[PDB]
Amino acid sequence: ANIYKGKITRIEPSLEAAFVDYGAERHGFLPLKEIAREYFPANYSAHGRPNIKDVLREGQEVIVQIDKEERGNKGAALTTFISLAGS
Amino acid sequence: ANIYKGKITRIEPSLEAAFVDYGAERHGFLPLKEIAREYFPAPNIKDVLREGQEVIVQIDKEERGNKGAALTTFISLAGS
Ligand SMILES: [Pb+2]
Ligand SMILES: [Pb+2]
C-alpha cells in the first residue's frame, strides 16, 4: 500500500520544495515538480515556475505516494503523481 | 489513516455503483454520485468504471451490519 495524506509542515522556497508529514516519524520531501496542477490555486504562465509559497500552505493536505523510500538519515522522496491502473 | 487505492471488482448497474477492493475483506461500495469527473470517460456506471481499474477512495461510512464501507473519491483534504 503506497498512498498517504500528507500535511505540509515546512515550505522551503529556495529549494522549491516542502516537508510533508505523511504519518511516518520522519517527514518526507515534496519538490515543486512533483506537485500536480490540481493543487495550484491559480493557472501560472507557460514559462517559468511559481514560488512554492504561492502553491502550497502550511497545514494543507495533499495526496502523496513514496517515490524513494526513506534511507539512512534521509526522508522519503514524495510525489503527488499517483500511479493508478487504467488512468 | 483514511485513504486507499482501490481496485474495481464488480459493477452493478441496478445499484448504479461499483464494488471496490481497497484492502479489506468486505469490498467497499462506491456509488456513481461519489465518483469524481477525473474518472469519467472522454451516463451510467457501466460507461464510467471498469473491472481492474484503480481509484483513490476514502471511507465515508465504516463497515456496519453486513455492509462494506461506503466509499467516495471526493477526498477530504485540509486547507483545500
Ligand atoms: Pb517525477
Ligand atoms: Pb511562449
Coordinates of C-alpha atoms in Angstrom, one line a residue, chain A residues 2-5 7 39 57 59-63 65 82-86, chain B residues 2-5 39 50 52-56 58 75-80:
Chain A
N2 CA 1.6 3.2 -1.2
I3 CA -0.7 6.2 -0.6
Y4 CA -0.9 8.8 2.1
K5 CA -2.5 12.1 3.1
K7 CA 0.3 17.5 5.7
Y39 CA -3.0 21.8 -6.1
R57 CA 0.3 26.4 2.5
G59 CA -1.2 22.7 7.2
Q60 CA -2.6 21.9 3.7
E61 CA -3.1 18.2 2.9
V62 CA -2.0 16.6 -0.4
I63 CA -2.2 13.0 -1.6
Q65 CA 3.0 8.3 -2.7
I82 CA -0.3 8.8 -8.1
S83 CA 0.1 5.6 -10.1
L84 CA -3.4 4.1 -10.9
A85 CA -4.1 1.1 -13.1
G86 CA -6.2 2.4 -16.0
Chain B
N2 CA -8.3 7.2 5.7
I3 CA -7.1 7.0 2.1
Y4 CA -6.8 3.9 -0.1
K5 CA -6.0 2.8 -3.5
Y39 CA -12.6 9.0 -13.7
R50 CA -14.3 -1.0 -15.4
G52 CA -9.4 -3.8 -12.7
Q53 CA -9.2 0.0 -12.7
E54 CA -7.9 1.7 -9.6
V55 CA -9.5 4.7 -7.8
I56 CA -8.4 6.8 -4.8
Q58 CA -11.7 7.3 1.4
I75 CA -11.2 13.1 -0.7
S76 CA -11.3 15.3 2.3
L77 CA -8.1 17.4 2.4
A78 CA -7.4 20.1 4.9
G79 CA -6.8 23.6 3.6
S80 CA -8.1 22.7 0.2

